[PDB]
């Protein structure tokens, strides 16, 4: 009687051939088992699980992209590459009829330091093209009661979360957001990290075999997006299936603009205010420069908040009229005391120092390398909490100079009579990386030779023992840190001239970047022509 609807329901949705007969079989097995039993439920709900899951019921693919673009932009400033990844996807959809859909099609994985917008993107990309969204929080999940659901006969039962997503969503092409996939815990006991291996696999997932829906399911035309703020912890196989997409954090120009457009107005309306207070742009650069030490914004918004909270706590103690603007002068009154230092580029040509650009996920830092040469016996002491790699690089540049002593006007036998000391302030924070090569090669030269080194010029580059200048990594975050300090001359290895096209075109105008392929050009470009100090005598 009432089963007949369900029997009619099976023919309606989907369905693949083999499961249909498989379904009607168990129905014709159910229909002859009597009205509730330890066997009816464990079988009836199976069918009420086979019918509810979506089979071949999907959503269209919007050939319009000018709309799909004009909805992404209103949600996230920047992120140009990820946005493009979606456009090209729709552009393919527009250009395809009668073929595969997701046969090797983007199963994205986003990577980037926390504080940038990754988990706040799935809902956006969904709203971009009208695909019913759903989250799957996976940080810390360390069992198989997940994706590979339990067998249909245990006292209780439930399919995997994934199959449970298709049930909760309505269609067969949703946007599932496998949040925090890099927290898979391999604490023995079957880390799913092995379970997903079948799901994300772009060629075998169309036959995903659950344990509740033991019939093969096809998650082919799903659109996975998994956020993860690292890659070392992801297993090597599972990472391969995904398509890495880096999110390199934000500049100061982005963090500035992204506050004026999205962040600040979001904080006004939540703070009861509506335009009883409004900040000035330059007085946000002060908040980013001094009160923020992180790439991303999940820390920045917590500052504009306290501005707004303090911007309303006053409105109760005493009201006012008109937009009470805020400038750099007023900033310390609201937030607090300068919690960081805007490291200033210091200009007068010094002896035994050199500007240095260091890279860090949070951004670039402008280091100065200080070197002392005193009478001694050649003992080379490297302090400043230097890492093992850098110490070796320092000895390289020095061993280079001892080979070309006559060229740069060095003491003929300094190697034997001069205690040489290199210091990289400050002392607390550990440092590493070999990109400091040509910095020290200048300073050590500007120490032994008394020709002071210009500090208008900030240099960076890995130096070889022969005198070659190897290429380095992370040129953008350095030059960005450079221009913010206020330096307009950069010394750079030729092999990095390629990575200039990531700098904003604006900043590239005010940079006299020099490309050098050997350390000889650098020491001629940096060291002042005539010495100023007496030598070690």
Ligand X SMILES: *[B]([O])([O])[C]([C]C1=[C][C]=[C][C]=[C]1)[N]C(=O)[C]([C]C1=[C][C]=[C][C]=[C]1)[N]C(=O)C1=[C]N=[C][C]=N1
Question: Which residues within the stretch 106-125 sit at the binding site for a second copy (CB under 8 A)?
Answer: 106, 114-115, 119-120
Shortest reach from residue 10's CB to ligand AGS, in Å: 34
- Asked whether position 329 contacts a second copy by CB under 8 A, the answer is no
159 is in an annotated binding site: no
164 is in an annotated binding site: no
Nearest to 324 by CA among 279, 368, 271: 279
Stretch that binds ligand AGS, among 31-39, 70-78, 426-434, 445-453 (CB under 6 A): 70-78
Of the residues 146, 180, 294, 477, which one makes contact with ligand AGS according to CB under 6 A: 180
From the CA atom positions of the chain, what is the Rg in Å? 31
> Binding of a second copy at residue 362 (CB under 8 A)?
no
b/e per residue, 472-501, with b = 16+ CB within 10 A? bebbbbbbbbbbbbebebbbbbebbeebbe
**Degrees to nearest 5, angle at CA 337 with 290 and 316:** 110
For residue 424, state whether it binds ligand X (rule: CB under 6 A): yes
Q: Which of residues 478-537 bind a second copy (CB under 8 A)?
A: 495, 498-499, 501-502
Catalytic residue among 183, 255, 476, 478: 478
State the binding string over 353-392 for ligand X (x if CB under 6 A, else -).
---x-xxx----x-x----------------------x--
Count Cβ atoms below 10 Å from residue 88 Cβ, excluding itself. Answer: 12
174 part of the interface to ligand X, by CB under 6 A: no
Q: How far apart are CA 105 and CA 203, in angstroms?
A: 10
322 is in an annotated binding site: no
Closest C-alpha among 398, 232, 365, 245 to residue 295: 365
Catalytic site residue from 271, 435, 446, 449:
435
Residue 311 labelled as part of a binding site: no
Does position 33 bind a second copy by CB under 8 A? yes
H/E segment holding residue 414: helix 414-417
Binding positions for a second copy, 267-326, rule CB under 8 A: 267, 269-273, 294, 296, 298-299, 301-302, 305-306, 308-310, 312-313, 315-316
Binding segment for ligand X (CB under 6 A), chosen from 222-230, 352-360, 374-382, 402-410, is 352-360
Asked if 76 interacts with ligand AGS (CB under 6 A), we say yes
Give the separation between CA 374 and CA 377, rounded to whole angstroms.
Answer: 9
Q: What's the CA gap between 126 and 136, in Å, rounded?
A: 15
Applying the rule CB under 6 A, the residues between 234 and 273 that interact with ligand AGS are 237, 240, 258, 262
Per-residue exposure over 414-438, b if at least 16 CB sit within 10 Å of its own CB, e if not: bbeebebbbbbeeeeeebebbbbbb
How far apart CA 414 and CA 198 sit, in angstroms, is 65
Residue 365 interacts with which of ligand X, a second copy, ligand AGS, none, CB < 5 to 8 Å by class: ligand X
Tell me whether residue 478 is one of the annotated catalytic residues.
yes
What is the spatial distance between Cα 334 and Cα 311, in angstroms, rounded to a whole number?
8
Rounded CA separation 411/299 (Å): 52
Q: Residues in contact with ligand X, total (CB under 6 A)?
A: 17
DSSP β-ladder status, 462-463 and 469-470: antiparallel
Binding residue (CB under 8 A) for a second copy from 356, 434, 461, 474: 434
Q: Which does 77 bind (CB under 5 to 8 A by kind): a second copy, ligand X, ligand AGS, none?
A: ligand AGS
Question: At CB < 8 A and 24+ separation, what contacts does 32-40 make?
Answer: none
Question: Site mask, ligand AGS, residues 432-471, x = CB under 6 A?
Answer: ----------------------------------------
State which H helix or E strand residue 290 sits in.
helix 282-290
The DSSP output letter for 428 is S
Q: Give the binding-site size for ligand AGS (rule: CB under 6 A).
A: 21
Q: Which residues here bind ligand AGS, judged by CB under 6 A? A: 76-79, 114-120, 180, 203, 227, 229, 237, 240, 258, 262, 297-298
Residues belonging to the binding site for Mg(2+) are 357, 435, 460
Q: Which residues here bind ligand X, judged by CB under 6 A? A: 356, 358-360, 365, 367, 390, 424, 429, 431-436, 472, 474
């Amino acid at each position: 009687s009432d089963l007949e609807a369900l029997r009619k329901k099976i023919e309606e949705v989907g369905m693949p051939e083999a499961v249909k007969t498989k379904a009607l079989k168990e129905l014709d097995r159910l229909e002859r088992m009597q009205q509730g039993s330890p066997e009816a439920t464990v079988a009836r709900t199976y069918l009420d699980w086979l019918t509810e899951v979506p089979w071949s019921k999907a959503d269209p693919e919007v050939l319009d992209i000018n709309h799909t673009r004009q909805v992404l932009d209103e949600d996230h400033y920047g992120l140009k590459d990820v946005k493009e990844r979606i456009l090209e996807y729709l552009a393919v959809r527009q250009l395809t009829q009668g073929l595969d859909v997701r046969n090797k099609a983007p199963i994205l994985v986003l990577v980037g330091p926390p504080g940038v917008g990754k988990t706040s993107l799935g809902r956006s990309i969904a709203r971009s093209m009208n695909r019913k969204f759903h989250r799957i929080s996976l940080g810390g999940v360390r069992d198989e009661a997940e994706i590979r659901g339990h067998r249909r006969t245990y006292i209780g039962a439930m399919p995997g979360k994934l199959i449970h997503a298709m049930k909760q969503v309505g269609v067969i092409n949703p946007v599932i957001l496998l949040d925090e996939i890099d927290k898979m815990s391999s604490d023995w006991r079957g880390d799913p990290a092995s379970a997903m291996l079948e799901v994300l696999d772009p060629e075998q997932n169309n036959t995903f075999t659950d344990h509740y829906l033991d019939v093969p399911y096809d998650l082919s035309k799903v659109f996975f997006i998994t956020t993860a703020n690292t890659l070392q912890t992801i297993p090597r196989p599972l990472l391969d299936r995904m398509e890495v997409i880096e999110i390199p954090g934000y500049t100061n120009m982005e963090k500035q603009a992204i506050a004026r457009q999205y962040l600040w107005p979001k904080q006004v309306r939540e703070s009861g205010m509506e335009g009883r207070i409004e900040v000035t742009d330059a007085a946000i650069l002060r908040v980013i420069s001094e009160y923020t030490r992180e790439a991303g914004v999940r820390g920045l918004e917590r500052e504009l908040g306290k501005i707004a909270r303090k911007g309303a706590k006053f409105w109760l103690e005493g009201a006012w009229e008109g937009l009470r603007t805020i400038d750099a002068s007023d900033i310390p009154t609201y937030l607090g005391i300068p919690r960081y230092r805007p490291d200033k580029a210091e200009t007068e040509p010094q002896v035994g120092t050199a500007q240095g650009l260091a890279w860090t996920p949070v951004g670039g830092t402008l280091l100065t390398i200080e070197v002392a040469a005193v009478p001694g016996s050649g003992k080379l002491s490297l302090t400043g909490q230097l890492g093992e790699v850098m110490k070796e690089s320092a000895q390289a540049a020095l061993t280079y100079l001892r080979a070309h002593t006559q060229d740069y006007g060095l003491p003929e036998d300094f190697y034997n009579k001069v205690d040489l000391h290199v210091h990289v302030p400050d002392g607390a924070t550990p440092k590493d990386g070999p990109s400091a090569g040509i910095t020290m090669a200048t300073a050590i030269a500007s120490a032994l030779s008394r020709r002071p080194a210009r500090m208008d010029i900030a240099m960076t580059g890995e130096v070889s023992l022969r005198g070659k200048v190897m290429p380095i990594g992370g040129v953008k975050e350095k030059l960005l840190a450079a221009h913010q300090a206020g330096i307009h001359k950069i010394v750079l290895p030729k092999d990095n001239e390629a990575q200039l096209e990531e700098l904003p075109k604006e900043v590239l105008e005010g940079l006299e970047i020099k490309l050098v392929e050997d350390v000889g050009e650098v020491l001629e470009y940096l060291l002042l022509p005539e010495p100023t100090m007496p030598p070690v005598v």
